[PDB]
């Protein structure tokens, strides 16, 4: 079912792949329906976050010499207070994609599975119980209807702002 850990962990990996970019462009390309509305709404918010230059200046100033340490330190800081919300989950996905775009690797195709693994690892160990309390990944979909694209963007950017300003 939608609240089973198998399904929650399955839909989440499909979201990461469709959201996390490994390049800046798109030329040449790379060659469920409720899942599709999530994949697209994540994209719309990603480009809205990408166009907040206050956020980008602070993201660019983040050290990435140790990508693993940076990821787990930042993800843990986002969920340490125990008051989870969907905006923080979006901020987790976005920060994961920014790491992929700013951390070198002679086999970047491996660094992307590695960073995707870190996010799913953190999701399983820390968020899986809360996500099924929310009816599954449908909670994120219904969360995008409780506000406009700016209400979510400003909030998600503030989550990232608080977690990148200390760690």
């Amino acid at each position, epitope marked *: 079912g939608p609240t089973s850990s198998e399904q929650i962990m399955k839909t989440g990996a499909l979201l990461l792949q469709g959201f996390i970019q*490994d*390049r*800046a*462009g798109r*030329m*040449g*390309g790379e*060659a469920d329906a409720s899942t599709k509305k999530l994949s697209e709404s994540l994209k719309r918010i990603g480009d809205e976050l990408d166009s907040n230059m206050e956020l980008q200046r602070m993201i660019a100033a983040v050290d990435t010499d140790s990508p693993r340490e940076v990821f787990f330190r930042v993800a843990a800081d986002m969920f340490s207070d125990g008051n989870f919300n969907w905006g923080r989950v979006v901020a987790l996905f976005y920060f994961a994609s920014k790491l*992929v*775009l*700013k*951390a*070198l*690797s*002679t086999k*970047v*195709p491996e*660094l992307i599975r590695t960073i995707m693994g870190w996010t799913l690892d953190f999701l399983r160990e820390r968020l899986l119980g809360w996500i099924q309390d929310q009816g599954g990944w449908d909670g994120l979909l219904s969360y995008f209807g409780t506000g406009t694209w700016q209400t979510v963007t400003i909030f998600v950017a503030g989550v990232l702002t608080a977690s990148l300003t200390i760690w």
Partner: antibody
Amino acid sequence: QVQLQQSGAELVKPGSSVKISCKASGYTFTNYDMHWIKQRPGSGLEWIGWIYPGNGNTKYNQKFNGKATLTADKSSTTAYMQLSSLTSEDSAVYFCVREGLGITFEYWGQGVKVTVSS
Amino acid sequence: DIQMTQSPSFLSASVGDRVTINCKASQNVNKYLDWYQQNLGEPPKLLIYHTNSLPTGIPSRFSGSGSGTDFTLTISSLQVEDVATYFCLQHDSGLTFGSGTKLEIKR
């Protein structure tokens, strides 16, 4: 202005290699993909591949896999292409070109004419 | 790979003519088709991207249209500096350039 300054013309013997550089300036180097293009009479314009300087990711045309190797150095804002196992069929003009954002090949390098002959 | 058939290969026109160049794709490439202009000894220059968008600085007399498989670049009134070679480029699946169209002036 965005500027893409490419290295000097090349005269190489067959079977050797050559490394062409593309010096970028006027923008944040790690926010744009950089492509390479081959122009030659008959073959025309062919896409070789691109590289994203932000993390070093690359994608290659199947016809140029093994032939070309795309690299970039963040701190120098320079892109490199290494052409291997040179033959007469590789005598051509090679361009680096930047892929824009919401826009395609807007800024080009001037081209580097590579001449392979014995 | 996707094949691009460009036509005509050679086009004779006069200053002030409405000129049309055609490009056909062996497979639907959606909107991801550009047109480039090249003069002698120079890199190509973006004239039209995404079937019909004009880069900043490109004169309005250039316009483009398409369907996914059939595409057309149009010069509404040819001027002298438009005498060049023109190429189409699909970037939907891989990247493929057309063979080119050489535009000359009549006399």
